[PDB]
Ligand binder design. Sequence first.
Ligand SMILES: OC[C@H]1O[C@@H](O[C@H]2[C@H](O)[C@@H](O)[C@H](O[C@H]3[C@H](O)[C@@H](O)[C@H](O)O[C@@H]3CO)O[C@@H]2CO)[C@H](O)[C@@H](O)[C@@H]1O
Ligand SMILES: OC[C@H]1O[C@@H](O[C@H]2[C@H](O)[C@@H](O)[C@H](O[C@H]3[C@H](O)[C@@H](O)[C@H](O)O[C@@H]3CO)O[C@@H]2CO)[C@H](O)[C@@H](O)[C@@H]1O
Ligand code: MN
Length: 211
Amino acid sequence: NDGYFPPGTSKHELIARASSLKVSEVKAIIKKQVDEHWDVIRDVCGFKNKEVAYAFFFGMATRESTFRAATETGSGASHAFGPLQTAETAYANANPNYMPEHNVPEMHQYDFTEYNFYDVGISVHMGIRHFLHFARLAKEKYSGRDIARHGLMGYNTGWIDGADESWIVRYADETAALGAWYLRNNHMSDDEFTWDTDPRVDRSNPWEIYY
Ligand SMILES: OC[C@H]1O[C@@H](O[C@H]2[C@H](O)[C@@H](O)[C@H](O[C@H]3[C@H](O)[C@@H](O)[C@H](O)O[C@@H]3CO)O[C@@H]2CO)[C@H](O)[C@@H](O)[C@@H]1O
Ligand SMILES: OC[C@H]1O[C@@H](O[C@H]2[C@H](O)[C@@H](O)[C@H](O[C@H]3[C@H](O)[C@@H](O)[C@H](O)O[C@@H]3CO)O[C@@H]2CO)[C@H](O)[C@@H](O)[C@@H]1O
Ligand SMILES: [Mn+2]
């Protein structure tokens, strides 16, 4: 039951309706997916509880889209849509040159179709799956916070290793810090959001809250 909008909704309407979703509604979509997939999320990432897992994915929504669910960027393998900026590489049958993601059997891999790419519900499901693809690769060589940290580097770059430490900080550590703002300031359900570089956000020891 992953799709949010009616099957058959046009591309234009999927985008327009995503654009009009309230922040609280995007948070609810993310929570639904985290609830549905908690066991695999916990097994891969070792997050302490569902609440901090919600916050982690709110951090991703913040870093990727500033909670603007109709955000669309990139080209080819980087072409991404939705609150988590789910790339085409997440999807089954998208392009023969995309590296396969057959290591998350706990989550269905939706086919690459207009509805599956542009529906916010499918997009969020697939973003979580795509992140777990890379986090599971990271767990082969990393532990603790480094699973999620390098999983995020894979999500954004295609590669769990080899990014600059300064992008690990500006992208992955930023994501962790942004997510914690929601938990610490009672924004887990309301329409409030933070943003990349917001000076209010506490960036010290940004991973500790999750474990
Ligand atoms: O490269 C990582 C991801 O970046 C996403 O873009 C984000 C920008 O990196 C981020 O700086 C920007 O933050 C803005 C915010 O949108 C604005 O409202 C505020 O006033 O200033 C902030 C700092 O400049 O947010 C965008 C996301 O909305 C890409 O969308 C994503 O594809 C990419 O992976
Ligand atoms: O050399 C190995 C194979 O590489 C394939 O290209 C991959 C890029 O190397 C990788 O950087 C890119 O990663 C995407 C990522 O999947 C996505 O989530 C993010 O938004 O954008 C990243 C790029 O900025 O994925 C591609 C495809 O898997 C070549 O296509 C392949 O021929 C080659 O064998
Ligand atoms: Mn799902």
